Ligand binder design. Structure first.
Ligand SMILES: Cc1cc2nc3c(=O)[nH]c(=O)nc-3n(C[C@H](O)[C@H](O)[C@H](O)COP(=O)(O)OP(=O)(O)OC[C@H]3O[C@@H](n4cnc5c(N)ncnc54)[C@H](O)[C@@H]3O)c2cc1C
Ligand SMILES: NC(=O)c1ccc[n+]([C@@H]2O[C@H](COP(=O)([O-])OP(=O)(O)OC[C@H]3O[C@@H](n4cnc5c(N)ncnc54)[C@H](OP(=O)(O)O)[C@@H]3O)[C@@H](O)[C@H]2O)c1
Length: 512
């Protein structure tokens, strides 16, 4: 049938895209998701230790103040089952499920350049027509299974963290974990005390700081809910949106005693972004500052891990670091008698047999269970996995063959009436604040189309290449170089797009 808008995704971005377009702008709209329930990545990713790296009171929606006062704030950080339960309550309250079609994947989306709408086809050969396409696909594509010889011969339990089954038990089992990223650190910390023996196959050690996830008292929660209006105003007025006191103090402008005290204070409070952006202001910019942040965490590793040779294996060797990981006792794990750490860069994995992982030294690591916390493909992977064709039938895979590009992280030279929520080339901040910022900006432009009887918004290649130059300008100011992301912060990003919404959407081709 016909719709004013069609949304792909029932996660954070899709649920708010549905609420804003349907109830506030009174548009006819339908959303689609492969899953059986809302939640997005929080429905799929149920691996042990899954936890937000934003604090509980900020990893949520800000637009429903009755929901904020209603909100469950159990611990300082929120687990996957509680994020899922929160998103379900959002769907229960605002009557969202009746306009979501579940168990329905989108195969193709073709823009009708004549009638100026999109032709969307599901994986079941069902076709829907709609003026606008809202893509809220998130950061997911399950496969980065390790390309290891004989991985298909393993007869024990083999799980990727994105497809974690239920009823997994660990007692009496020899378990292996490949990968020490954010997910691997969470899995290893959660299961180490439950397994008979754990082998960690680390190819690249990373910096991790304690998260300090503690229960929240009723007065801790009251201290938040009573000041929630000011808390969100600080989010909109910040670069990261994590509720941090973002520092402008340069690292080398204080004594070594003063520097050590500031790093220790953030370490005790917890949080990876706090240690990097609440301590000082040039850790991601100046090289000498970045090395000081490294040395503090290296000193912490050498203090926690009592075996100096294990601590050495856990210490990163790269000269310059980016954002640390957050953990609830990761480095303490490696003091346990039932934990073995394997440097698979000096001793790579060469084969997987029916009952073991064998490294280059010939040692067979016998395992009952092998966990692959090996990550996924890139941002665009969610977009290139759908057959999206825009003007002159050009596909989203072809136009993004040389990496992704967009205008304000929301529109592409492929997009005539297709708006990206949390898409590539967006800001680097707390996701729910970013998602609210884009959904409100996208609905404003769509409302700016219904009143003026316009039916085709497009973005120039000049505007897309101008957004690429903006991001490339800020990105090369930082150590994070050596254009996927805008690194100017959430506040400046809201100003970049406000100058567009004010100047009658400069860079956008409107056709009546
Ligand atoms: C364990 C974990 C912890 C995290 N913690 C934080 C945090 O603390 N702070 C933060 O800012 N971010 C965090 N993130 C990142 C997180 O992805 C975002 O916060 C947020 O979930 C993004 O919401 P989204 O709706 O844009 O994407 P998603 O939540 O991933 O939703 C995407 C949905 O679109 C669906 N979909 C896709 N494609 C298609 C298709 N062709 N047809 C049909 N349906 C489709 C998918 O099935 C999926 O349900 C975390 C991620 C994980 C996995
Ligand atoms: N920044 C955060 O705090 C945070 C928190 C939650 C989610 N996320 C996002 O979720 C995404 C995925 O996180 P993730 O931890 O699941 O994966 P990841 O960050 O991409 O890291 C995957 C880990 O598995 C290792 N690995 C991959 N292939 C391997 C192989 N063939 N052999 C041996 N080891 C291999 C990698 O080692 P190498 O490093 O050597 O490649 C890496 O340590 C991240 O990109 C991140 O953006 C981030």
């Amino acid at each position: 049938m016909d719709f004013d808008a069609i949304i792909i995704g029932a996660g954070f971005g899709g649920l708010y895209s549905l609420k804003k377009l349907r109830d506030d702008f009174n548009l006819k709209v339908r959303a689609f998701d492969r899953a059986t329930e809302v939640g997005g990545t929080w429905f799929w990713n149920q691996y042990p230790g899954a936890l937000s790296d934003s604090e509980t009171h900020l990893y949520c929606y800000s637009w429903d103040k009755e929901l904020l006062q209603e909100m469950e704030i159990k611990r300082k950080y929120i687990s996957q089952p509680d994020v899922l339960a929160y998103l379900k309550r959002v769907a229960d309250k605002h009557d969202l499920r009746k306009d979501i079609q579940f168990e329905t994947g989108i195969r193709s989306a073709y823009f009708d350049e004549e009638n100026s709408f999109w032709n969307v086809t599901t994986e079941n050969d069902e076709k829907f027509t709609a003026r606008f396409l809202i893509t809220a696909l998130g950061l997911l594509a399950a496969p980065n299974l390790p390309k290891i010889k004989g991985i298909e011969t393993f007869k024990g339990e083999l799980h990727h963290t994105s497809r974690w089954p239920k009823d997994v038990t660990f007692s009496g089992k020899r378990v292996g974990v490949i990968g020490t990223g954010s997910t691997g650190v969470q899995v290893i910390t959660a299961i180490a005390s439950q397994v008979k023996h754990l082998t960690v196959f680390q190819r690249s050690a990373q910096y991790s700081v304690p998260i300090g996830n503690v229960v929240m008292s009723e007065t801790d929660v009251a201290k938040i809910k009573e000041n929630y209006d000011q808390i969100w105003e600080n989010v909109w007025n910040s670069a990261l949106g994590y509720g941090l006191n973002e520092s402008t103090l340069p690292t080398m402008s204080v004594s070594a005693e003063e520097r050590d005290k500031i790093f220790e204070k953030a370490w005790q409070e917890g949080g990876g972004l706090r240690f990097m952006f609440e301590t000082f202001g040039d850790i991601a910019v100046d090289e000498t500052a970045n090395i000081e942040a490294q040395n503090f965490i290296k000193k912490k590793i050498s203090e926690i891990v009592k075996d100096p040779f294990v601590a050495k294996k856990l210490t990163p060797t790269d000269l310059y670091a980016c954002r640390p990981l957050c953990d609830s006792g990761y480095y303490e794990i490696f003091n346990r008698d039932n934990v073995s750490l394997e440097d698979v860069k000096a001793n790579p994995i060469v084969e997987i047999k029916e009952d073991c992982v064998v490294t280059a030294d010939g040692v067979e690591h016998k395992l009952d269970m092998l966990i692959c916390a090996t990550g996924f493909d890139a941002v665009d992977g969610s977009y290139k996995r759908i057959d999206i064709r825009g003007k002159d039938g050009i596909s989203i895979k072809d136009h993004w063959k040389d990496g992704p590009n967009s205008y304000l992280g929301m529109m592409v030279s492929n997009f005539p009436n297709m708006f990206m929520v949390f898409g590539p080339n967006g800001p680097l901040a707390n996701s729910p604040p970013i998602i609210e910022t884009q959904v409100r900006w996208i609905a404003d432009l769509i409302g700016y189309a219904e009143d003026h009887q316009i039916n085709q918004i497009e973005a120039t290649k000049d505007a897309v290449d101008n957004w690429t130059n903006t991001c490339s300008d800020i990105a090369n100011k930082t150590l994070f170089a050596k254009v996927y992301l805008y690194m100017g912060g959430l506040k400046e990003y809201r100003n970049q797009i406000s100058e567009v919404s004010n100047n009658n959407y400069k860079g956008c081709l409107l056709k009546q």
